Symmetry: C3
């Protein structure tokens, strides 16, 4: 059974090897995907900041206009 | 030391590896769904941003006449 | 070759798997952490965006009294 247990081990080892290299490729793809998503969230944030800052100016212009 | 002892160890580790690989796969899949979910969320947020930009523009000319 | 050789090999590949496994676990946790963080920020963005929308309604009202 030793020969057979060992053969079973070499087969499972092989499948492990193949899976691990798949997990590795996907993980590093996901990191990049996340980089893109962070990129967009940050730009969105900047756009939001610009919008908010312009609201303040609008609110201030309205006050000047009120006089 | 004996081959039987070493194969027994190897089997023990092999099993631990199979359970770990399953958890990895389960948790990788969760992280991929989240990537897709986050991406859907960002698209929705960009969309609302643009509309806000365009309404703020409609306000800016409403104000420009009254100046 | 010998069951001895095949077992030594299995042990060497099996150590390689354990190390790689630790590294992929890490990389996956980093991907989870980055997602959770990014979820927080996109909710904050949207919360502030909702405040900008209610603010613009008040701005139209104020604009109405000016004319
Ligand atoms: N929605 C919206 Au606005 C401004 N300023
Ligand atoms: Na986090």
């Amino acid at each position: 059974s030793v020969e057979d247990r060992v053969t079973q081990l070499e087969r499972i080892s092989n499948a492990h090897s193949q899976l691990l290299t798949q997990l590795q490729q996907q993980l590093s793809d996901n990191q990049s995907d996340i980089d893109s998503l962070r990129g967009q969230i940050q730009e969105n944030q900047y756009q939001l900041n610009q919008v908010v800052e312009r609201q303040k100016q609008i609110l201030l212009q309205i006050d000047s206009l009120s006089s």
